[PDB]
Amino acid sequence: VHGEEYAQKMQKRFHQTDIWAPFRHRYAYMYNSSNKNVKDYKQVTLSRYINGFDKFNV
Amino acid sequence: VNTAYPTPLKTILKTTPAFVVYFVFGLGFSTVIYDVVYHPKDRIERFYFRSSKFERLSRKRDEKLRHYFKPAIEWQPWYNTSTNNNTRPLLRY
Numbered sequence: 297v298h299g300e301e302y303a304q305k306m307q308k309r310f311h312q313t314d315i316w317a318p319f320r321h322r323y324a325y326m327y328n329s330s331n332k333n334v335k336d337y338k339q340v341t342l343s344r345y346i347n348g349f350d351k352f353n354v
Numbered sequence: 355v356n357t358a359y360p361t362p363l364k365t366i367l368k369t370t371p372a373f374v375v376y377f378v379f380g381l382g383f384s385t386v387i388y389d390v391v392y393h394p395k396d397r398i399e400r401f402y403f404r405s406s407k408f409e410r411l412s413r414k415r416d417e418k419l420r421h422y423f424k425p426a427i428e429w430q431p432w433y434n435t436s437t438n439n440n441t442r443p444l445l446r447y
C-alpha cells in the first residue's frame with residue numbers, strides 16, 4: 297500500500313544473500329537444541345496419565 | 355525320624371513374613387507405576403534424552419506438524435482468540 301519499493305526495502309535484510317541466517321527470538325539449548333515437549337502445558341501435564349494424547353507415530 | 359528344619363534356617367525364617375509383605379507392597383507399587391506410565395502411551399516409551407539427535411527429530415516431527423505446522427499454514431486473521439489465550443511459542447522467549 298505504501299509502495300512496492302518500500303515493501304522491498306522492508307523485506308530485504310542482507311546485502312549478501314549467499315548466507316542463510318534464519319530469524320529466531322532465541323536459540324534452543326536443552327536436549328541438543330531440540331524440544332522435548334512439543335505440546336501445551338495442559339497436554340504435557342495430562343498425557344502422562346491420560347490416554348489419547350499420544351498419536352502413535354507408527 | 356525327626357525331619358525338622360536346621361537350627362540356623364529355622365531362626366532365619368522368623369523374619370521371612372516381613373520380607374513377603376515387603377515384596378507384595380513393592381510389587382504393587384512398581385506395577386502401579388508401570389501401568390500409569392504404560393496406559394497413556396500403550397507402551398513404555400524410551401526417555402527423550404535417551405536417544406540420538408536424528409531419532410529425537412524423527413519422533414517429534416509428527417507432533418510438531420500436528421501442533422504448529424497445520425495451524426500456522428491454515429492461520430486466518432480472525433482465528434486467533436481476542437483474549438490472547440493462544441498457544442505458547444515452541445521456544446518461549
Ligand SMILES: CCCCCCCCCCCCCCCCCC(=O)OC[C@H](COP(=O)([O-])OCC(O)COP(=O)([O-])OC[C@@H](COC(=O)CCCCCCCCCCCCCCCCC)OC(=O)CCCCCCCCCCCCCCCCC)OC(=O)CCCCCCCCCCCCCCCCC
Pocket residue numbers: 347378379381382383385386389390392393394396
Ligand atoms: C457396594 C455398592 C456398590 C458401589 C458402587 C461404586 C461405584 C462403582 C463404579 C461405577 C462406575 C463404573 C463405570 C464403568 C464404565 C467407565 C469406565 C471407564 O471410564 O474406564 C475406562 C478407562 C479407559 O478405557 P480403556 O482404554 O478401554 O481401558 C482399558 C485399560 O485401560 C487398558 O489397560 P492397559 O492395557 O493400558 O494396561 C494398563 C492398565 C492395567 O492396569 C490395571 O489396572 C491392572 C491391574 C494393575 C495392578 C493391580 C494390583 C493391585 C494390588 C497391589 C497390591 C496392594 C497391597 C496393599 C493393599 C492391600 C490389598 C489387599 O492400567 C491402567 O490403565 C492404569 C491404572 C492404574 C490403577 C491403579 C492401581 C489400582 C489398585 C489400587 C490400589 C489402592 C491401594 C490399596 C487399597 C487397599 C484397601 C484395603 O479405562 C481405565 O482407565 C481403566 C482403569 C482401571 C483402574 C484399576 C481398576 C481395578 C483393577 C482390579 C484390581 C482391584 C483391586 C482392589 C483392592 C481391594 C482390596 C480390599
Ligand SMILES: CCCCCCCCCCCCCCCCCC(=O)OC[C@H](COP(=O)([O-])OCC[N+](C)(C)C)OC(=O)CCCCCCCCCCCCCCCCC
Pocket residue numbers: 345346347348
Ligand atoms: C474408609 C474408606 C477407605 C477407602 C480406601 C481407598 C484408598 C484409595 C483408592 C484410590 C484408587 C481407586 C481406583 C479406582 C478406579 C479408578 C478408575 C478411574 O478413575 O478411571 C481412570 C480413567 C482413565 O481412562 P483414560 O485415561 O482412557 O481417560 C481418557 C478417556 N478419553 C480419551 C476418552 C477422554 O478415567 C476415567 O474413567 C475418566 C473419568 C474419571 C472420573 C473421575 C474418577 C475419580 C475416581 C475416584 C475414586 C475414589 C474412590 C473412593 C472410595 C471410598 C470408599 C469408602
